[PDB]
Amino acid sequence: GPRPRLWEGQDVLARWTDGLLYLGTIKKVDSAREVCLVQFEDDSQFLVLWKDISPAALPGEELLCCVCRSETVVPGNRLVSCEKCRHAYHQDCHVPRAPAPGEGEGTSWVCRQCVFAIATKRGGALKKGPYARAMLGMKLSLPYGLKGLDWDAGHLSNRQQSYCYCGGPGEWNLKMLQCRSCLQWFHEACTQCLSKPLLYGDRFYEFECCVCRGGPEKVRRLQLRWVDVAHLVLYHLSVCCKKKYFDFDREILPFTSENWDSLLLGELSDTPKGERSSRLLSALNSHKDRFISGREIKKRKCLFGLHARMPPPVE
Numbered sequence: 001g002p003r004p005r006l007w008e009g010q011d012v013l014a015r016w017t018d019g020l021l022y023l024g025t026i027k028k029v030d031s032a033r034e035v036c037l038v039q040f041e042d043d044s045q046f047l048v049l050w051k052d053i054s055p056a057a058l059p060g061e062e063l064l065c066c067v068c069r070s071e072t073v074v075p076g077n078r079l080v081s082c083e084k085c086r087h088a089y090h091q092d093c094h095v096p097r098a099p100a101p102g103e104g105e106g107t108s109w110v111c112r113q114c115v116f117a118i119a120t121k122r123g124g125a126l127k128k129g130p131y132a133r134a135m136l137g138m139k140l141s142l143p144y145g146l147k148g149l150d151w152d153a154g155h156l157s158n159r160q161q162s163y164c165y166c167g168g169p170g171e172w173n174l175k176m177l178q179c180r181s182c183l184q185w186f187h188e189a190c191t192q193c194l195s196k197p198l199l200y201g202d203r204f205y206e207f208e209c210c211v212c213r214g215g216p217e218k219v220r221r222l223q224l225r226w227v228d229v230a231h232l233v234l235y236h237l238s239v240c241c242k243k244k245y246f247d248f249d250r251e252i253l254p255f256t257s258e259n260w261d262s263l264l265l266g267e268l269s270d271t272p273k274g275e276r277s278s279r280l281l282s283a284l285n286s287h288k289d290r291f292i293s294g295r296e297i298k299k300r301k302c303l304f305g306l307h308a309r310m311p312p313p314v315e
């Protein structure tokens with residue numbers, strides 16, 4: 001065709017596996033694999049699926065639905081403009097169907113991409129205000145067909161890499177929650193029900209999504225045991241820091257101490273520090289099936305790391 005949607009040198013927003021949008025520049029378009037090599041603001045380069053790439057509108061493209069690229073307007077399906085990004089959508093090209101002017105619910109209408117761009121946040125999306133309310137509205141619908149997804153055997157990943165309310169990519173074990181009803185996975189940043197950010201690898205939750213609920217999410221934090229605490233802290237640090245071994249006194253205990261309330265430890269919350277340390281140390285030292293230990297006595301280091309790559313079992 002004479003006018004591709006994407007091209008080398010184009011500035012774009014790309015949705016990452018955390019559901020968030022990052023600014024980048026397209027370096028390569030691969031039409032065989034339907035991906036682009038995108039260079040981000042830290043100069044990192046990654047392949048991104050075309051579905052997860054949004055370019056800006058060119059001058060002269062208010063005539064055009066940004067989804068289907070078409071001019072045409074027919075009765076019942078008009079073009080509507082986003083009052084944020086000023087891109088245009090056919091009512092039926094937007095999910096959910098975009099309201100005709102003056103027929104919306106709030107002060108005004110802003111598109112799904114913009115609502116998510118403004119409302120999603122690391123640690124959990126905005127909970128209060130117009131964008132938070134608009135996001136909840138958007139989240140009652142999915143922008144992809146759930147039933148068509150090609151899942152792996154354990155229902156952890158699908159070939160389309162369509163997850164969550166956003167339809168972005170994602171890694172089930174990295175700050176995502178699985179809905180108990182539809183078994184789809186949802187990003188931390190796209191949810192509105194958490195009181196604290198998720199530990200990587202933490203599945204000690206029960207979750208039900210907005211689509212299944214037909215309204216606000218429901219979530220509950222399950223009770224951890226000390227072995228679960230040790231395993232989850234080590235997993236989280238392993239992911240955050242991309243290394244295997246962590247020093248107890250310099251890294252593990254301070255992390256647990258400094259982030260204590262965020263770990264949502266339930267009944268373990270008032271463990272009095274000295275006992276905090278010894279209980280955690282005991283868990284790390286005693287479960288050799290989970291934890292490998294090491295020593296560097298000349299540096300006064302006591303090291304622990306995980307045996308297994310998989311996140312802690314939920315029991």
Ligand SMILES: [Zn+2]
Nearest residue numbers: 019164166190
């Ligand atoms: Zn998401």
Ligand SMILES: [Zn+2]
Nearest residue numbers: 065068090093
């Ligand atoms: Zn359209």
Ligand SMILES: [Zn+2]
Nearest residue numbers: 082085111114
């Ligand atoms: Zn918009």
Ligand SMILES: [Zn+2]
Nearest residue numbers: 179182209212
């Ligand atoms: Zn669900």
